[PDB]
Design an enzyme around this catalytic site. Structure first.
Site, mmCIF file in Angstrom:
data_model
loop_
_atom_site.group_PDB
_atom_site.id
_atom_site.type_symbol
_atom_site.label_atom_id
_atom_site.label_comp_id
_atom_site.label_asym_id
_atom_site.label_seq_id
_atom_site.Cartn_x
_atom_site.Cartn_y
_atom_site.Cartn_z
ATOM 1 N N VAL A 1 0.825 -1.204 0.000
ATOM 2 C CA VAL A 1 0.000 0.000 0.000
ATOM 3 C C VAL A 1 0.863 1.260 0.000
ATOM 4 O O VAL A 1 0.545 2.237 -0.688
ATOM 5 C CB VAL A 1 -0.975 -0.002 1.194
ATOM 6 C CG1 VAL A 1 -1.374 1.420 1.570
ATOM 7 C CG2 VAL A 1 -2.203 -0.820 0.855
ATOM 8 N N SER B 1 4.930 3.305 1.340
ATOM 9 C CA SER B 1 6.348 3.237 1.680
ATOM 10 C C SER B 1 6.881 4.607 2.099
ATOM 11 O O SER B 1 6.887 5.549 1.306
ATOM 12 C CB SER B 1 7.153 2.695 0.494
ATOM 13 O OG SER B 1 8.535 2.632 0.795
ATOM 14 N N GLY C 1 9.208 3.270 6.796
ATOM 15 C CA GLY C 1 8.826 1.867 6.780
ATOM 16 C C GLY C 1 8.067 1.541 5.509
ATOM 17 O O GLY C 1 7.807 2.411 4.668
ATOM 18 N N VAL D 1 4.490 -0.692 4.179
ATOM 19 C CA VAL D 1 3.173 -1.065 4.691
ATOM 20 C C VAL D 1 2.480 -2.001 3.704
ATOM 21 O O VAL D 1 2.529 -1.785 2.488
ATOM 22 C CB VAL D 1 2.293 0.176 4.967
ATOM 23 C CG1 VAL D 1 0.984 -0.226 5.634
ATOM 24 C CG2 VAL D 1 3.030 1.183 5.838
ATOM 25 N N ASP E 1 -0.815 9.093 13.751
ATOM 26 C CA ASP E 1 0.461 9.664 13.281
ATOM 27 C C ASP E 1 1.012 10.723 14.240
ATOM 28 O O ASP E 1 1.285 11.868 13.856
ATOM 29 C CB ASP E 1 0.328 10.242 11.864
ATOM 30 C CG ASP E 1 0.497 9.191 10.781
ATOM 31 O OD1 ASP E 1 0.590 7.988 11.119
ATOM 32 O OD2 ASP E 1 0.537 9.566 9.586
HETATM 33 MG MG LIG Z 1 0.340 11.371 8.508
#
Ligand SMILES: [Mg+2]
Ligand SMILES: CCCC(=O)Nc1nnn(CC)n1
Ligand SMILES: [Cl-]
Ligand SMILES: [Cl-]
Ligand SMILES: [Cl-]
Ligand SMILES: [Cl-]
Ligand SMILES: [Cl-]
Ligand SMILES: [Cl-]
EC number: 2.7.11.24
Length: 345
Positions: free
Chosen positions: A26, A28, A30, A32, A162
């Site tokens: 999905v 990048s 890291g 995911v 986040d």
């Molecule tokens: Mg964010």
């Protein structure tokens, strides 16, 4: 210990427990993948951390992120579904994977593509403040609240995600949404900041849901400061005393003085109770801003406020932040936190 299986997806090796199926890249930091979690029935995001222990700064950031996600247990805040490593020993420990609920739309998609009633604005801002009362009660500062960091579903339910884990200089430069929601005292490093910076961001978000337009879309730090001071007024001597840099104080006094504007003539047609709350959030002196707990009792939220269902957090020990450790010591603390994880009910 579960059985793990390996596979290469988009030039990355993924070694995950059997329970996670149908992995699909999905994004990048890291990498995911989306996956189906057969143990719980949820669609999940699986994040493989990139080089989590390459330096002292990166090792401590990995530990900080895992401690934060393990602590957050609230309906309006992202939490941790799972964390795992394929390592069987500390000596072989290298990789960390984090599992969360898969999120779909953010507030950007709603704010730009939807006609919001005042009832929608009440419910969305209520949920941000309910999650913030919880976050702030643990002496945690989010630091990066903005529409792209707010997940929303079809039922208008909202989660904060986040957290700021300590953004760079190129990231905050020019005509960029990464700076439009930041409080002025942190944007220009005027003073040691605190949890009050998050309330400034909530005010910028609320204004944008009401008008459909960015509140302070500055083309650079200085243009943005001029937009802010035109709305809320230039500072008096009381706030000037609180700014540590003499150059910064000298710069402020170089600007012609301006009064605070009439917010009912800026937010034309808005609920008078929404106008009143915006005046209490968008205050230049951070000491005088309304807090999340105080804002939940404001009459704008009368339809949703329930003082018996607005919980606080367990205590959160952040003494590790002032600790000086070696890479392998941060790595061993992280390993202990992975193996001690207990899943939610
Ligand atoms: Mg964010
Ligand atoms: C992924 C798990 C995050 C979590 O624990 N969320 C959550 N929501 N409300 N609570 C306690 C009332 N806990
Ligand atoms: Cl499994
Ligand atoms: Cl969650
Ligand atoms: Cl590993
Ligand atoms: Cl955004
Ligand atoms: Cl003047
Ligand atoms: Cl703790």
């Amino acid at each position: 210990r579960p059985t793990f299986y390996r596979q290469e997806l988009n030039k990355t090796i993924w070694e995950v427990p059997e329970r996670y199926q149908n992995l699909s890249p999905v994004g990048s930091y890291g990498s995911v993948c989306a996956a189906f979690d057969t143990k719980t029935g949820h669609r999940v995001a699986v994040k493989k951390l990139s080089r989590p222990f390459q330096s002292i700064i990166h090792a401590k950031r990995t530990y900080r992120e895992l401690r934060l996600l393990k602590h957050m247990k609230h309906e309006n805040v992202i939490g941790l579904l799972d964390v795992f490593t394929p390592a069987r020993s500390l000596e072989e420990f290298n990789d960390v994977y984090l599992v969360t609920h898969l999120m779909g739309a953010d507030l950007n998609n709603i704010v730009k593509c939807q006609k919001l009633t005042d009832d929608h604005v009440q419910f969305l801002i209520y949920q941000i403040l309910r999650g913030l009362k919880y976050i702030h009660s643990a002496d945690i500062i989010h630091r990066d609240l903005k529409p792209s960091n707010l997940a929303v579903n079809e039922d208008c339910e909202l989660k904060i995600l986040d957290f700021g884990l300590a953004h760079t200089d190129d990231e905050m430069t020019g005509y960029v949404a990464t700076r439009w929601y930041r409080a002025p005292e942190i944007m220009l490093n005027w003073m040691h900041y605190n949890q009050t910076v998050d309330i400034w961001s909530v005010g910028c978000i609320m204004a944008e849901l009401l008008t459909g337009r960015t509140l302070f879309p500055g083309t650079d730090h200085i243009d943005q400061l001029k937009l802010i001071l035109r709305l809320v007024g230039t500072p008096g001597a009381e706030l000037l005393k609180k700014i540590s840099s003499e150059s910064a104080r000298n710069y402020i006094q170089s600007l012609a003085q301006m009064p605070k504007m009439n917010f009912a003539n800026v937010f034309i047609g808005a609920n008078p109770l929404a106008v009143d709350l915006l005046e209490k959030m968008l205050v230049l002196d951070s000491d005088k801003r309304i807090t999340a707990a105080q804002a939940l009792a404001h009459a704008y939220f009368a339809q949703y406020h329930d003082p018996d269902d607005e919980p606080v957090a367990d205590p959160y020990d952040q003494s590790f932040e002032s600790r000086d450790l070696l890479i392998d010591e941060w790595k061993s603390l992280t390993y202990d936190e992975v193996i001690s994880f207990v899943p939610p009910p």
